């Protein structure tokens, strides 16, 4: 594959029209150090306008007003266009993020599935009828789109996270104002192209690109946005919350990442489990809200199992993201690169044993990190508690099932969890007693958009995808009708 | 003839199944009789750190959440049955601390019994999803589980009834509770703690920590070990709870806040039926109600006549002693709210709106009473048009077309409740669909049991209470994916 | 618009292969009297072969072990090939049935809608988990396809009823043996071609064409069919029930027709109502099971209303179905035509008062009948009680809402009913208290496949369409797991 | 304890007790002493009862009330059931022969059924479609079907009655009950309870008598809208014919089974053995859901077979009034003979008896001993046919797929059991064995929260849970258009 001759100039998208931009962020491949894109830096005026378009499009019934059939037509068309242009979107995703082309193309197939699921849930979205309240009273509960929804996506899965929110938000008849990561805006603008091509009315999907402190905060505080999906860090989630209270009490769907445990029992398929732990921390080079960063292993196989994980971690093919054979790609931002390398550092200083990795992968160009494992970890240590968002794995030992669930639940977070055992009783106890919203039993990062996803504790608020994720962006209306004459209260 | 107690009743607070005495005490006097009635314990943040501890042990020990929905349903159904037995007591204390008429107060208790039976029913029906349709290899599952320790903060306007519209739905899932009633209406909450204990609630599953919002309330909104908070009250304190949550442990919030609820009357409605419903809407609980009908929106052809029919109803309402079963509206619960409502009437006059009725106190020598009030010639900018007054003050708006009615009905930062009054299916259905309010009444007002959810759009808050939706608000959805057979390795 | 020069010779479809006929039913256009098709008359051996194909396809995992993603992918591509080939299915539907081409094309749009809905339901199909049963006991309710489903369709909506059943049945992973009506077999075989083109595995969808006395009855008694969808007459529905009892206790989806009421209040839009009444009884020339055959109008406006309906019925364009302006077309079978003319005869003979129509429309070629309205009908009269399946309207008068409901309920059936009132309390009273499974308030025959459909009383069993319809062809399994060691019953 | 004279009952129509003009004289199957006098009613008594249920449905005296009111009557009934638990246990043993310990454990599940039902009455809901356009609104209503017939068998007279009646009642339906002729008492005691709890007249009618007079009158009745029937596939088939031949009444059928219990070595073979013993011995094998086909892994089969033999040879048989008695009498001489006939045929077909095989001459009554046959071929009579006695047949297997084929080698699909600690095997069996009531490392567990019912020839529809309450509701689709309509003719 060739890298671009010249960087690709992009516009931003508002009320159906693409605009040129007056200031531009030049993004380079973090894998190649060569310019690839020019994304417009939008203003608060650019954002107020996007929100104004989204409101017009909602109120004038051009989208919420249609039969669900017509919202489903657009999402099915989009899903179809997505498949047609998969190789395009994978190409651009890799260029801005650094992920392997194989991983990228896998994610595009999941997006297609997301759109098709949303198209289905557009028609299935329902409330209740209560015909059982008596001859006088009729109850019913309606669902309706909340209105103008702002979506803020991070740079880990720019296109897949975008596609795990946008189609579910639209299916109910909501309008969208999206602000992608500045470093990964291109695949989000390509979705704009696709949705326009698939016949999405003007104003319904608007992309305002730029920084979180200009456009992001202008959205988190905006007085006319009804609800915000934000996916990212617990810190910036907490900013969104303050902004909500301080503005218009807008609803918040928060997906905020975590310190996710993977519990391994001696009576598991140790080989398969070791493969899953390696994938679970190396996948997207460990730049993952749902990565399995804490290993919780039965002591009887702890030392063995750790070294099985090393065996898998050192076999991982690191290289050019464009090589179909490459398994893990580049660290997306220099900021995240220094954080990760600084955490491994501290870990070695806090008193932990480096069993493997701990260093960069020298390619001359780009930023790469070795899959890393740490043992002899105290729950005090920084690498035991803090989300590192790199391919660094801490190991912890347990004697009894109660101990494993306690070490797994010793977090402020609660996004994902994993349990590896052949014992139905152990699998169900850990599954039912570890406070996490996304669980895998003898599997890793499976599940389509059929099912919801989200976090316990500090890993956020609400659930995305499935019929539950369509529903999050609808408002519940209770309606009581009295039939016949009413007994007057007064005299 | 009802008699007030000879000496104020000194209560305790309830932590880990044990009842506590109190060190410092708040002295409450009837809002309607101006007579000492209760002595509630002023609690501490340490008393609260301990209540949350009682509830964490109760949730972590499996004494309620490891029990079966049937053993939790048994307690709730027992609780409903103890409420039927004690209806008269709860009525008495609620009246003493609130000012409500006794008749209303007894009505509210029957809704509270319905609520507990709904919670007992939901406890068994609480369910997630199976996905047997994902392939030979993959099996999908969505669990629900109790979120854990729930902080509950109730207001003073429906002290016992709003408590019974939260506590039992929270308890059904296997959540543990820590409750703060309002300090002016703390007694009937501690009576509920009595009922739940006699009904066989395990220790620690229900704690009641009485005191102020500035001390205990805040300590709860920022508590590091409370998993969810249910707040009912004002949008302003709701924003406080949101901030508190972000600065503490990113706890979930059930917020049920204020309203400026419209009631749309069309000319083709039953004017006399609608007039009665409007006066009730705004006068019930002396307009001290988040779901009150505080904005009349009436069709020009019948607007002035209807305004005058509503004032004739308003002025026929029997005001007096809340213990007289003939009394229809009661006292204003707090001096603050009294002063706020008289200030708003004052503003209403100042800003150019015309009083048609009311606009001052009702003198009984003892108590704080306000006369039902209607303003007309109200412009949408006016304070009385926009601000929640939380008294019996109604602002009337005139409209020509259905589109205008709905424009005015939506013309608020809020969206808790709404009413539409028409016999035309097309209008009722239009206004029901296009007005952004989470609780709607077609040719009725404040009807519907706990079968259905309730809650707000916009600034009237987050989440829904009651029905199955209510039980589920305090649960966490857990996705489970199981792979059966040998896995295809990622790494050769 | 050209008629076929020679009749088009089909084969049947078994285990993904087209099979030639040995013997053939020759069908001529019910409206042109020109040969149009030659369809294979199959045997019980051909039926047995198709069932064994459908059985091997369900137990091999070629469709039912597949993921809901894969099934949805075939159903969505099918819907896509259906819109692509819309005009070709219409052409052949019209040639065999008599439908106006305009109505034909509209029925195709609904078929597409049906396919998209089933595709969405393929993924949404779910059971229930019970986490609340205690720390010892975990409960769980699974749905799974029932297995080999027999589908038997009538000639009135050959393709539309097919598409309102087949895709819903397929969505769960059930396999099909289809037997359409011999007079209208062509569009069912064109769906077999379509399904195959869209990537449906072999054995999932077989069509065995032939008579009810041979293949139909062979299906109703088949010892390896798990469930049977029959649409048609109460009489054959009852046959099917007897067969299931004498066979393998297969579940039955029965859609068996009715004498449906349309309730017209004076406070209604009488103009809109009159149009609706004309449509309800004239649409598909009254050969609809959801046909408004019983007008129940308020006495205060009955005479005025009756005249309006008559004004509507005479303005109805009857003629060659391929003229895009014809609004009603030919009677499908000479049997039904004799039944309709006999019922109009009987009607007149029993003292009923003919207001309009009441005889054939002579075009020299074809079989056509006039929109026909009787007044002065007593509930004892034959036209009042018996299903005519022609464009014949009986008018009843009422004075009270009670009398309207009492009349509307005065039948053994309960498939459809309509109410026409601007009064919310009257429309609600009639809706809640009239025993009909398919209701229309100030409309007639609205509603895509989002919602279930089916009958009360003697109009049949079970529901079709919506997520409820997909679930009708699944079996509910309850699973209880106890975790830990158990309390022995024997010490 | 000893009954001095038979207790002569009445039947219950339109809230009144009517007197029997002819009677069935039941004797305790365990004591051979006259215990009860059940009125044998006429087909005009049945028509009279259906007319009452119909009246009570149509006058909105029950269906018309708020769910809150239906729930009250049901919760009150649950109350009176707990406070009368002993009375009903007494009469339940007297007519059935079941151990008093087991009888009381049932009344506890019956109370569970009543409370669930009361919850379901309030939570019963359909759907709103607000997603169809500015002009189109869509809505799905559920309503009580109307007058339901309920026929109960004699194995669990009161528990199966309570596993149908409260769920049928919760939606707004009225009922016409015919308990089993040998076991009508506890059903008549339920009628007394529902009345005292404030259930209107006509909502719950009991017409006692024969299946040939009253039952068949019901399955054919032109004004019964639906029939729950629990029992045999053949009387189910008779009900199907009768429905077709009459008015097309819907049918909630819960029929019989040959339910396999699969035991792997990966299991707690000791916890399984106790469960297999139970599975087959509970109610002296007089269960539609009894584990009657042991499916065990060859490698541990002979060991396990023995471990179960030991468990069966230890079960305490005797006076059902002894609270230490673990299995009781055979309810009918008809069944007793069928069971011995089947043990007899089993020896004859070349199957090996490891234990049981004959009656238990406990002084009086009909008591049969827990019986285990091994070296059973699928062709054998005892392999295929439902025995409804404590007779277990043992099969051996090497593979999981092998195990699943034997379990699915039946015309039935009511119950199944899997005993394994391997999640993969438990999950495969559960997913691939066509049975509607599943138990993984447990047996006959499950409360009213979960629906129950059969695959294949074990019946139609589901009972219990919210799904079970909904089976007796009818789905109405409502589409409303708003504003002026595009006219079809100019
Ligand atoms: N009782 C009612 O509801 C009445 C119904 N009608 C309407 O008249 C129309 C014509 O009915 P009619 O032609 O008599 O029959 P049906 O429409 O009921 O038969 C429909 C289908 O069943 C097949 N079939 C025939 N015999 C059997 C059998 N023994 N077992 C299973 N399937 C069988 C037919 O095959 P084949 O092609 O060989 O016929 C056909 O494909 C129906 O659409 C019905 O709605 C009108 C009067 C009364």
Author numbering:
A (entry chain B), C (entry chain D): 8 to 498
B (entry chain A): 7 to 498
D (entry chain C): 9 to 498
The article reads:
Finally, L‐sorbosone is further converted into 2‐KLG by a NAD(P)+‐dependent L‐sorbosone dehydrogenase (SNDH). Sequence analysis showed that the SNDH of G. oxydans WSH‐004 belongs to the aldehyde dehydrogenase (ALDH) superfamily (ALDH‐SF). Like other members of ALDH‐SF, SNDH has three typical domains: bridging domain (Red), catalytic domain (Yellow), and cofactor binding domain (Green). The crystal structural analysis found that the SNDH could exist in two different catalytic loop conformations, i.e., the oxidizing SNDH (O‐SNDH) with a closed substrate pocket and the reducing SNDH (R‐SNDH) with an open substrate pocket.
To verify whether the formation of the disulfide bond is a key factor affecting the motion of the catalytic loop, the crystal structure of R‐SNDH was analyzed by adding dithiothreitol (DTT) to the crystallization conditions. As with the C296A mutant, R‐SNDH was also resolved in a homotetrameric state, and each subunit had the same mode of action as mutant C296A. As expected, R‐SNDH has an open substrate pocket, in which Cys295 and Cys296 cannot form the disulfide bond, the sulfhydryl of Cys296 toward to the cofactor pocket, which called ‘resting’ state, blocking the cofactor‐substrate‐channel. The pose of the cofactor NADP+ in R‐SNDH is different from that in C296A. In R‐SNDH, the nicotinamide ring of NADP+ is extends to a solvent region, this pose should be that the sulfhydryl of Cys296 blocks the cofactor‐substrate‐channel, causing the cofactor channel of SNDH to have no space for the nicotinamide ring of NADP+. In R‐SNDH, although the nicotinamide ring has a larger displacement, it still has a hydrogen bond with Glu294. The pyrophosphate part loses the interaction with Trp162, and forms a hydrogen bond with Gly239. In the structure of R‐SNDH, the nicotinamide ring of NADP+ cannot enter the cofactor pocket because the catalytic residue Cys296 occupies a part of the cofactor pocket, and Cys296 should be in a ‘resting’ state. In the mutant C296A, since Ala296 has no sulfhydryl groups, an enough space can be left for NADP+ to enter the substrate‐cofactor‐channel. This indicates that SNDH may first accept the substrate during the reaction, which makes the sulfhydryl group of Cys296 point to the substrate pocket. Due to the deflection of the sulfhydryl of Cys296, the nicotinamide ring of NADP+ can correctly enter the cofactor channel to complete the electron transfer.
